Amino acid sequence: LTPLAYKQFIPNVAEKTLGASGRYEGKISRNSERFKELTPNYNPDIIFKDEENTGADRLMTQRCKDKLNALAISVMNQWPGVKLRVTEGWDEDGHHSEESLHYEGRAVDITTSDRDRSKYGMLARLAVEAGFDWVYYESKAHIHCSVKAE
């Protein structure tokens, strides 16, 4: 397995295009009918930063949970004692550029549990192999992953 390079995205097209994660349909807020489509991921082998102390980062689409859960396994296999960590997931409060897939519960920013930045290129490759529809080595501090809508 080859790490992603800095600022590399896979597939090599923009996130919201048909070959990647596809179109932004619209913001999901806590009242939405579409809010019911989000369910929480309480996998004990995934660390959630929970920046806002709401548990919001755990709420995500079905596809997102599936890929995230696959990645959790491969991370632990790659580096014994290390776990997948999510820094940001569903955003209810506009902490992104508009039309962010975080507003739809279809995108996570991730690290390893140990915050070892040298692992993140490999973590990105693991995310691709776990079946995330778009993976972007967005910064030294995290990888951005998203999935197609249900």
């Epitope: 800095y6 600022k7 930063k49 920046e51 820094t87 920013d109 690290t111 915050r115 967005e138 910064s139 030294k140 501090a141 995290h142």
Partner: antibody, heavy 119, light 108 residues
Framework: QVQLQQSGPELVRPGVSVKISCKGS????????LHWVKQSHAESLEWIGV????????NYNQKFKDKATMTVDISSSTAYLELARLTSEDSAIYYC????????????WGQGTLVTVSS | DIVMTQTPKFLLVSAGDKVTITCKAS??????LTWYQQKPGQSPKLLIY???NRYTGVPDRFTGSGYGTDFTFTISTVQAEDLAVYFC?????????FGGGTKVEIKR
């Protein structure tokens, strides 16, 4: 509400050290990197270094390697910057500032501590 | 260490007019370019990161562009409250380094 509260302005003699403080509230202190930045006439803004409370890792700008020491007290949610062997070139405002793990840039800043080196 | 050259040093502009500030890095820094605003007496406030992404709550009139060495910060329709020094910062290289700033003054 995230807040970084720094210690007050300091008059300090040349050759002496000064220790300044930055207390974080309104978020989980240990979770985020804390950076220190110097603002002077001479050089506008300069990054001094970063401390990662969760690991105790420190990274210094080589230019401040022999000048600056960064520590933290988790129990009081306070980061400290010690500047040793002060000369007039150390007179400046010193800020602490946090990142939010999007990259090494800073949403929340302290109010700044003015350090005047003088006899 | 990467050097950030910011121009112009000073701008005079009427409320409603456009502001264009440039920062050039001494080597390519990807899109790892942050723009801050420092009003008088105050600490810097982050407006744009990754060259073009607005921070939470930052008004639409602020934009940024560029990838590599050459970056552009724009205030589309400058408001009275926008008087400040603006600074860029790169964090592609270590250490992070900042530009020397652009002071934006209002004509009335």
């Amino acid at each position: 509400q995230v807040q970084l509260q720094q210690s007050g302005p300091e008059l300090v003699r040349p050759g002496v050290s000064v220790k300044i403080s930055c207390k974080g509230s309104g978020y989980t202190f240990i979770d985020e990197a804390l950076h220190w930045v110097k603002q002077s006439h001479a050089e506008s803004l300069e990054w001094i270094g970063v401390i990662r409370p969760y690991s105790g890792e420190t990274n210094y700008n080589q230019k401040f390697k022999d000048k600056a020491t960064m520590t933290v007290d988790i129990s009081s949610s306070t980061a400290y910057l010690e500047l040793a062997r002060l000369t007039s070139e150390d007179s400046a405002i010193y800020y602490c500032a946090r990142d939010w793990e999007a990259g090494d840039f800073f949403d929340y800043w302290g109010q700044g501590t003015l350090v005047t080196v003088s006899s | 260490d990467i050097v950030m050259t910011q121009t112009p040093k000073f701008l005079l502009v009427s409320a409603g007019d456009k502001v264009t500030i440039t920062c050039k890095a001494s080597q390519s820094v990807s899109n790892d370019l942050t723009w801050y605003q420092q009003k008088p007496g105050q600490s810097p406030k982050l407006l744009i990161y990754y060259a073009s992404n607005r921070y939470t709550g930052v008004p639409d009139r602020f934009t940024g562009s560029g990838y590599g060495t050459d970056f552009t910060f724009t205030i589309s329709t400058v408001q009275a409250e926008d008087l400040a020094v603006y600074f860029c910062q790169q964090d592609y290289g270590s250490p992070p380094t900042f530009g020397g700033g652009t002071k934006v003054e209002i004509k009335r």
